[PDB]
Write a protein that binds this ligand. Structure first.
Ligand code: MET
Ligand code: CL
Length: 237
């Protein structure tokens, strides 16, 4: 029986979240995982364990580290495949493209990651995201400029009342945000490229077998249909 960690997301619950009146889980990443398990040649008995304080998204670096220390046999969620995590776990091949973008109010001076860096303005990020350490370590954005944000309603409010000048987050969250809230746009293109995967212990054969199962979902069209089930774009209006 695999003890599978699942993030107890406080927002963008479409990706993965607690089933409201229980300890059960649901979402895009859960449906991908359960669909993929059906295509594995051998049994993968499992149970899901929620991770997080229940008030804000968990820290995904700490979440993934729970596989390294044996608390979880695997983690399933909207987990970016970023270099420092691949040191301590084996990921599947990605099941969705993702990377960091800048989002700002339509008509902003900010044109992309370069004008964000040279700006004085505060920058929002999603609490628990690898974006926080990427901005501090790789882009050398002052920690004093970063504001944690919890939800798309908070993104819209922080951009509109000038708590932040811009938000850096991964494309899939930004796509849901822009489907709900008017007046904002992606500035520039992705400046990272790391999809989402599931994570297993170093040298786990399941990381490879689950890659083949994810590919099988892609080739049958199930993977696109699971995205359409949870993440269908719409008019902010
Ligand atoms: C807070 S968003 C979920 C975490 C983000 N996708 C990451 O892998 O860091
Ligand atoms: Cl990276």
């Amino acid at each position: 029986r695999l003890r599978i960690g699942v993030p107890d997301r406080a927002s963008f619950k479409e990706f993965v979240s607690r089933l409201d009146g229980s300890n059960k889980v649901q979402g895009y990443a859960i449906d991908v995982f359960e669909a993929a398990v059906k295509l594995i040649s051998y049994p993968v008995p499992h149970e899901f364990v929620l991770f997080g304080d229940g008030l804000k998204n968990p820290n995904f670096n700490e979440f993934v580290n729970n596989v390294t220390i044996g608390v979880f046999d695997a983690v399933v969620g909207d987990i970016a495949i970023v270099t420092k995590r691949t040191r301590i776990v084996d990921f599947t091949q990605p099941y969705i493209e993702s990377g960091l973008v800048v989002v700002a109010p339509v008509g902003t001076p900010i044109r992309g990651v370069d004008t964000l860096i040279s700006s004085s303005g505060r920058v929002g990020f999603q609490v628990g995201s690898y974006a926080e350490n990427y901005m501090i370590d790789e882009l050398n954005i002052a920690r004093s400029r970063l504001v944690p944000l919890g939800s798309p309603k908070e993104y819209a409010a922080a951009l509109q009342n000038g708590t932040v000048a811009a938000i850096v987050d991964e494309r899939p969250y930004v796509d849901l945000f822009l489907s709900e809230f008017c007046g904002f746009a992606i500035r520039g293109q992705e400046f990272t490229r790391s999809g989402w995967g599931f994570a297993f212990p170093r040298d786990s054969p399941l990381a490879i077998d689950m890659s083949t199962a994810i590919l099988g979902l892609s080739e049958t069209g199930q993977l696109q249909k699971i995205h359409d089930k949870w993440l269908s774009r719409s008019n902010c209006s």
